[PDB]
Design a protein around this ligand. Structure first.
Ligand SMILES: [Cl-]
Ligand SMILES: [Cl-]
Ligand SMILES: [Cl-]
Ligand SMILES: [Cl-]
Ligand SMILES: [Mn+2]
Ligand SMILES: [Mn+2]
Ligand SMILES: [Mn+2]
Ligand SMILES: [Mn+2]
Ligand SMILES: [Mn+2]
Ligand SMILES: [Mn+2]
Ligand SMILES: [Mn+2]
Ligand SMILES: [Mn+2]
Ligand SMILES: [Mn+2]
Ligand SMILES: [Mn+2]
Ligand SMILES: [Mn+2]
Ligand SMILES: [Mn+2]
Ligand SMILES: [Mn+2]
Lengths: 86, 90, 105, 99, 108, 92, 77, 96
DNA sequence: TCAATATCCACCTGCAGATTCTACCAAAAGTGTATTTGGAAACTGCTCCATCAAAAGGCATGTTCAGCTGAATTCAGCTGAACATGCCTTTTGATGGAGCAGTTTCCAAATACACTTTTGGTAGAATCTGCAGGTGGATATTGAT
DNA sequence: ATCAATATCCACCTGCAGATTCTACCAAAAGTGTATTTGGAAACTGCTCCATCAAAAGGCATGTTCAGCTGAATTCAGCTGAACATGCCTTTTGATGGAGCAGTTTCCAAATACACTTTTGGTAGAATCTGCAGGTGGATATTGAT
């Protein structure tokens, strides 16, 4: 009826995934401490967007986070996103 | 030309009875008040539009405050707003 | 005779805020509680900044708050600093801050 | 004959070319989904999500991290290094006004 | 009551002047809206759309492709200085990045 | 539950500039996002322009000034040309 | 006129920015930067000025230009 | 006779100018530069004195912040001396 | 650690001048009524969303090991800091006047809405079609000979 | 002055999931006609700024000397990349059940609309008092010689 508790999922952002992202960002060589650092940064990022998104969701008296809520959060954070207005 | 000068001065006298303020600093306070007014009103406007509501109420103001203000400032501002509305309503 | 601000326990002008909301092209209609709430928030923020700036002014042995005091007050407060992260305060200068590596010995 | 072995860097460069050429998401879908739902669960409970909402979050997050890694790379290279370190990320984010 | 002619047709545009006008009216931008404002706006939006589709189509043909995909839009925008300026704070989903390796990283 | 979008107009323009080229649904979504974004930027700036000058009416002049503020250089000049020509023709 | 922004002025600005030591090539570089900045603000400012059908750039025109560059300025309203 | 060692007077100056708030660029050359640049956009312009003052506060605040970031770049490269390279890195990361 | 200097930093006083206080008066806000209306409550029809299931293979993880990077060190060339001189640019203070803003009045022109038709835009349905993968052979590049 | 040993291009092929075209209803423009606003053209006026003149002070340009910082050159020890085997868990596709959006109707609490009367905030001189311009002297730091 309900899913298993979500715990420590930030570790799901694996070393090779972060390596791939860095590759797209043009990085050739990566210090070992980078990955944890990245996990921190991403975490913060998500917390900031999702927070606002949920705020919008709560303002609309909904229980479902929509793509538009996310888009609005990103926009007000100066992170304008194209492609999900549909 | 209107400004918030007299209200800023009243508040100043509340928190520091024997303290004054330069003309430039008052200009900066006026800039501040107008700025935050625009941020909050603008966000509340967008909130109203997104939800197809034609009326900006205290609820939009509150949500906008939660979006715009960081942490403790948000909590306290929200408290003051709700408190003021409650008192006004009484 | 009674003002809305008197009733709300505020110093900031509820009537003015309401009028500015109506003519600000924000919405077709404006609720009765909205300007009360907004005025309260603005007054609160003003109070916080004037509190800290007044402290700085007293620390500089001056009775009048100047832009420098406002800058010191805002930048030394984490949340006020974030709130005004993209704002320039004229004649505010900057916080005294020298990178440790630049210091002698 | 000792078996073949590319020198350190060659495969890295190869990977750079490969992933700069393509546009697919680089984080695994399901774990990202879990992370988002976990973080969101910490603000409001029993939330649901449109799939497009999570997709939006992932596109945004990966674009953000990639750009960050560009700036980080520039910071490392500036210091005459080829290896990005936490210092580089911190400098990039400080100059961005993120910290 | 003559035969109807659309404002877009009169203005020589593809983009909907009437729709743009309605959106201006209900967007709470001003109390009144001039007759020429939605025409102008529709024209500008149409033009910008044209420039981006031009460049993106060019990019699509460069990849021996007949259908424009988000990647082509990214290539178009980022390889164009002024579009890149206009959309400096915009993320194109599934756009990826421009191929770019820092010279110092290449073998020596 | 009908939804409006700029899709057909974007497609007409596409057929104008590249007669033998199509476009994915996602890319169309990005184009719609784009049009809505620029709409809000221009309309918003024009609103502010009208307010600053104590005017209750947004005219083509507010739109033009907004275009000049928001768009860079040649893009701005060309957009201005398209707009002005469209209004002059429309009035006639 | 760009040379009117002298070396010691730039040194003063850098000092306020916490800079202890300054390369000789900095000054010209700085001037370029300054020029660009001004060109960006003034442009927009003048745009506002011409929309108002005026010939005099006001403090508010500047404030609006700065605001629209995300360089919000307090104290000149 | 006396001589402070290279660096001491620099540091002292840093404290002095970080303590104060006065404009650091001379008024007239700034005015001249502004009017010159402005002539290239629109002609026969005039300026309120407050407009020029606003431009100068903004310009100097911008330059100071830029120099902070520039300094951070130089220190990052294990230097104490800012170079055009540092400014360019700072401006690139700023998205300027 | 030390005499021998140079520079801040607090504190002082006479007043010029910013700030605070006053009082007049349009212009907002308040007020007394009178009417509308947005949206919240309340069913309710159906999308999508949540969770689970199977299975297959793609990818994460751990391991080994060595190349090459980052860090630490050495040293001196030449750059940038500090300081003294003396010239000139900027600062500061006036004067004169015209060239902009800012304002009123009044109508022609532009816009606002409501009513009444028409038609372009939309949602599926019916069609069309790139291109994703799948196969495989030339071409390029790489690292050790 | 090359061979193996891999990875990367480049063309070709075809079915289907995704795109495009077709259909036909109808929401929302468009046409039309009154009711309200408003843009400025003509005609004034107090002021801002610009132009010009002028003295003088302090800030800057310049030349000199040298301390020390930046960059090059060198050395080495671990760290991070490359490669490979294992097996986990993500991805893919679909089922099942229902929570929770939307769509529609209904009807008041709340908001808008006028016509007037109070109340208040902006403005500019008067009155009031505080920084500040310099100057002093004691604290604090710096420098070079030991
Ligand atoms: Cl309300
Ligand atoms: Cl580090
Ligand atoms: Cl118009
Ligand atoms: Cl350099
Ligand atoms: Mn939790
Ligand atoms: Mn009725
Ligand atoms: Mn209703
Ligand atoms: Mn090295
Ligand atoms: Mn030496
Ligand atoms: Mn038809
Ligand atoms: Mn293929
Ligand atoms: Mn109907
Ligand atoms: Mn009535
Ligand atoms: Mn009455
Ligand atoms: Mn009063
Ligand atoms: Mn005193
Ligand atoms: Mn003094």
């Amino acid at each position: 009826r309900h899913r298993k508790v979500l715990r420590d999922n930030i570790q799901g952002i694996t070393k090779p995934a972060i390596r791939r992202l860095a590759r797209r960002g043009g990085v050739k060589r990566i210090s070992g401490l980078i990955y944890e650092e990245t996990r921190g940064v991403l975490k913060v990022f998500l917390e900031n967007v999702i927070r606002d998104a949920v705020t919008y969701t709560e303002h609309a008296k909904r229980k479902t986070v929509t793509a538009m809520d996310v888009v609005y959060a990103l926009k007000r954070q100066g992170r304008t996103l194209y492609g999900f207005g549909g | 030309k209107e400004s918030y000068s007299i209200y800023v001065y009243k508040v100043l006298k509340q928190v520091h009875p024997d303290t004054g303020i330069s003309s430039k600093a008052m200009g900066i306070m006026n800039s501040f008040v107008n700025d935050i007014f625009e941020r909050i009103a603008g966000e509340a406007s967008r909130l109203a539009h997104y939800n197809k509501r034609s009326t900006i109420t205290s609820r939009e103001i509150q949500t906008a405050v939660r979006l715009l203000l960081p942490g403790e400032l948000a909590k306290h501002a929200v408290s003051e707003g709700t408190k003021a509305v409650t008192k006004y309503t009484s | 005779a009674k003002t809305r601000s008197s009733r709300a326990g505020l110093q900031f002008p509820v009537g003015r805020v309401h009028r500015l909301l109506r003519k600000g092209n924000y919405s077709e209609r404006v609720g009765a509680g909205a300007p009360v709430y907004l005025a309260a928030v603005l007054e609160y923020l003003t109070a916080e900044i004037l509190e800290l700036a007044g402290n700085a002014a007293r620390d500089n042995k001056k009775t009048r708050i100047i832009p420098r005091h406002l800058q010191l007050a805002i930048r030394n407060d984490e949340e006020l600093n974030k709130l005004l992260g993209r704002v320039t305060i004229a004649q505010g200068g900057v916080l005294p801050n020298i990178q440790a590596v630049l210091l002698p010995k | 004959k000792k078996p073949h072995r590319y020198r350190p860097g060659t495969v890295a460069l190869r990977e750079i070319r490969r992933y700069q050429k393509s546009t697919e998401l680089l984080i695994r879908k399901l774990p990202f989904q879990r992370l988002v739902r976990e973080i969101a669960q910490d603000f409001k409970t029993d939330l649901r999500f449109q799939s497009a909402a999570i997709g939006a979050l992932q596109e945004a997050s990966e674009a953000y991290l990639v750009g960050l890694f560009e700036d980080t790379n520039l910071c490392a290279i500036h210091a005459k290094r080829v290896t990005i370190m936490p210092k580089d990320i911190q400098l990039a984010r400080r100059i961005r006004g993120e910290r």
